[PDB]
């Protein structure tokens, strides 16, 4: 694929923005966030299978990547959605929350605060949609590569080749916009350093989920495999 | 500073490699690792104060950065030390451990495994010492920038300016070595993506320390401030 075709593939693969399920005519938070994220995950699977190179991996490796990255992907999506809404997190168009509304759950305002900080950072850098889809694909391919035989060596080589292709695509987007070569590598670095903070927020979020001690709230490898291991009957 | 002078400053600022304290004539693990890391932290402070731009920050902001980054810095140092020792972690020249020797502590082999994976990754990329010192400085300036007034806006602007200068330095190292422009941004991206895994390992390690429920094992803000807030009487 060319860089322009890579971008086009990623934009067309974008998942939709889902709504929270609550009667708007009625006067709770963990349940809304749980239901929303669970519905988003199904669309995640569909999106990941359209990330170029992802379906060339073994199904086992596909599951490992999604297992490691799913919460990071949910959060970067949230941060991107919330970019143009200072001080608020657009979990859904009908669920736009501020940090005060997170005080009703222990541990929530801390996570809200980091998401709000990342969204403000996105805003100051004026993150573009084309950069955002590249970053999200990078998360999917990178976050689990470190926890994977002759086959595994070939899978890791392919992942790094795709990641390199995404780097080239980000640089190409930046060159097309008229940035100097110095501005290009400076902006590439700034965007990739943000991914370390997204990892950070995900780990804090995973801590919260595991503390909930709920059977199904963290998606199992078997569930993720069931979702990814689709048949060809449709 | 020029890029060559930046590199020279970072190399000269490097901390020493400390030894574990144990009678080698005698026949335990958490205690050795605790003592070693605590002695390393004092040298960390000295090193951080020599990272160009770091001492231009407020002392409050200096402490915040070190509080967020100290375990990441310890682990990248470990991974770098262990690079030329496949399957082992060189905690110290007299404490070279394999993953089997981590099975004696619950949760240890999992952390060992991620450190070993990162060290193998360093080895395959043939990480250079000049790149390593740049990456370590990036960790110090980046890992806490998201949890910080007119003064704070100026502090964050300065941090991003220094980070941009470190990006330029990494690219300069790569250009001097004869890499193409494409190889330069591909390698920059590969190195910065590794920092997301170092964040990951640090968060898992922080989880372990907080579970220990030991008063002094996680350095307090006040302790870090006491260490950083030095007088000019020597
Ligand atoms: C798919 C498998 N089962 C998912 C079940 C599930 C998922 C998420 C949560 C809520 N959670 C866990 C980190 C959370 C908690 C907070 O304070 C404690 C603050 C913010 C959050 C996220 C922040 C990102 C985010 C993005 C979205 O797109 C949608 C929701 C959220 C909530 C509960 C249960
Ligand atoms: C400075 C303030 N007080 C520090 C007190 C302290 C620090 C560290 C640890 C041990 N720990 C916590 C993550 C650990 C535990 C493991 O399994 C459970 C495996 C590996 C580790 C690290 C891996 C990196 C690393 C690098 C070094 O340069 C030296 C040691 C280590 C151990 C205990 C107590």
Author numbering:
A (entry chain A), B (entry chain A): 310 to 336, 341 to 461, 465 to 550
Quote the study's own text.
Overall, this structure presents a canonical ERα LBD head-to-head homodimer in the asymmetric unit and RAD1901 is well ordered in the hormone-binding pocket. Its tetrahydrofuran core participates in a bifurcated hydrogen bond between E353, R394, and a water molecule similar to other SERMs and SERDs. The side-arm adopts a vector perpendicular to helix 11 (H11) and engages a bifurcated hydrogen bond between D351 and V533 to favor antagonistic H12 docking in the activating function-2 (AF-2) cleft. RAD1901 shares a similar tetrahydrofuran core to laso. Within their respective x-ray co-crystal structures, cores of laso and RAD1901 are superimposable, while the D-ring analog lies between H8 and H11 similar to structurally novel OBHS and DMERI SERMs and SERDs.
Hormone binding favors LBD head-to-head homodimerization, helix 12 (H12) binding over the hormone-binding pocket, and exposure of the activating function-2 (AF-2) cleft where transcriptional coregulators bind via LXXLL motifs.
